[PDB]
């Protein structure tokens, strides 16, 4: 294995209209997160967090229950939007990545909150579907 400088970074648009550009980065695994914190909080532009909540689970692949869907829609996102927080999840659809993403889309639609919860996602490079456009 040879260590090389990165090639995938910058903005990231989707086909859906009305939204800004997301930011991504191709990164080594054997590196330090201090330059990750400097890259996010300085170079892209993000505030300092007041709370970090990482959500794990997801034995129900296609459908999760409506009880937990009520929790993930309201009771997680209203606290991450009142306190000011980063919700760290996996950036792919599988598991509870969809139910978090649908919950953020539901909360961003259901109110004129004039802000969005900074939901950050990590993902391995190997399991992205169409990475050749990056």
């Amino acid at each position: 294995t040879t260590e090389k400088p990165t090639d995938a970074y910058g903005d990231l648009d989707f086909t859906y209209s009305g939204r800004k550009h997301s930011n991504f980065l191709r990164l080594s695994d054997r590196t330090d997160p201090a330059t990750v914190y400097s890259l996010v909080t300085r170079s892209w532009g993000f505030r300092a967090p007041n709370l970090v909540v990482s959500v794990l689970g997801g034995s129900g692949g296609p459908v999760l229950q409506t009880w937990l869907q009520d929790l993930l829609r309201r009771g997680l996102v209203r606290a991450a939007q009142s306190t000011g927080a980063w919700i760290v999840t996996g950036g792919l659809h599988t598991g509870i990545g969809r139910h978090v993403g649908v919950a953020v889309r539901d909360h961003q639609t259901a109110s004129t909150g004039s802000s969005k919860v900074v939901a950050m996602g990590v993902a391995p490079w190997g399991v992205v579907r169409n990475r050749d456009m990056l």
Binding site: T15, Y16, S17, G18, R19, V63, T66, Q69, H99, V102, R105, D106, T109
Partner: protein
């Protein structure tokens, strides 16, 4: 077609269906040909390519 926002609103809050984009584009043409601006704001805020 009924010009009732609450039905389409509640049916987009139902997390079972996995709404596909071509149904959203069909209902968007129903909202753009007729004069229903509130469905245009709702359906675009769900996420839809143009």
């Amino acid at each position: 077609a009924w010009n009732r926002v609450d039905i389409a609103q509640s049916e987009l809050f139902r997390g079972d269906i996995q709404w596909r984009s071509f149904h959203l584009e069909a209902s968007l043409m129903d909202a753009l040909l007729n004069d229903r601006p509130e469905f245009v704001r709702l359906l675009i805020s769900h996420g839809l390519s143009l």
